C-alpha cells in the first residue's frame, strides 16, 4: 500500500494432514518494509531435494 | 523446511524493479534490485553425511 510493503505472520503447530484445521487465529504485524515499487505478479522460492 | 522465499514484481524481468525475499538458512535477505531471474528460480539443499 502506497510504497509500504507490509508483512504479517503467525506460526502454529497443527495436526490436520491436508487442510487448515477448524479454528481461528490472527497474524501479527511484524514488519512494514519501505519498498516503493509496484507489484502485480509473484513467485514462491522452494527447496529441492 | 522446504518453502523458503518469495519473488515480487510487475513484469518479473530486468526492465522493471523487482523484489526478492530469501528466507535462507540463519538469515533473511530482502533485496530490491533490477534482477534477471531464472526461468525456473529456486534454492537447493544438499545433504552431507
Amino acid at each position: 500500500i502506497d510504497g509500504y510493503f507490509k508483512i504479517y505472520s503467525k506460526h502454529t503447530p497443527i495436526n490436520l494432514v491436508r487442510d487448515l484445521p477448524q479454528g481461528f487465529s490472527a497474524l501479527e504485524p511484524l514488519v512494514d518494509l519501505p519498498i516503493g515499487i509496484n507489484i502485480t505478479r509473484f513467485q514462491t522460492l522452494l527447496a529441492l531435494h | 523446511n522446504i518453502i523458503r522465499g518469495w519473488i515480487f514484481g510487475t513484469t518479473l524481468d530486468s526492465k522493471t524493479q523487482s523484489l526478492l525475499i530469501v528466507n535462507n538458512a540463519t538469515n533473511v535477505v530482502i533485496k530490491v534490485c533490477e534482477f534477471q531471474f531464472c526461468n525456473d528460480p529456486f534454492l537447493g539443499v544438499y545433504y552431507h553425511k
Binding site: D2, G3, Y4, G36, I37, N38 | K15, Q17, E34
Partner: peptide, 26 residues
C-alpha cells in the same frame, strides 16, 4: 553547488520509475 548531470522525466505516491524504455521511440 549545483551549477547534464541532473535529469527529469500518473504514479502512485511514493513510487519509483527506473525504466528508460521508449514510450516509434522517444
Amino acid at each position: 553547488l549545483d551549477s547534464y548531470n541532473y535529469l527529469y522525466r500518473n504514479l502512485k505516491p511514493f513510487e519509483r520509475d527506473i525504466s528508460t524504455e521508449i514510450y516509434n521511440c522517444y
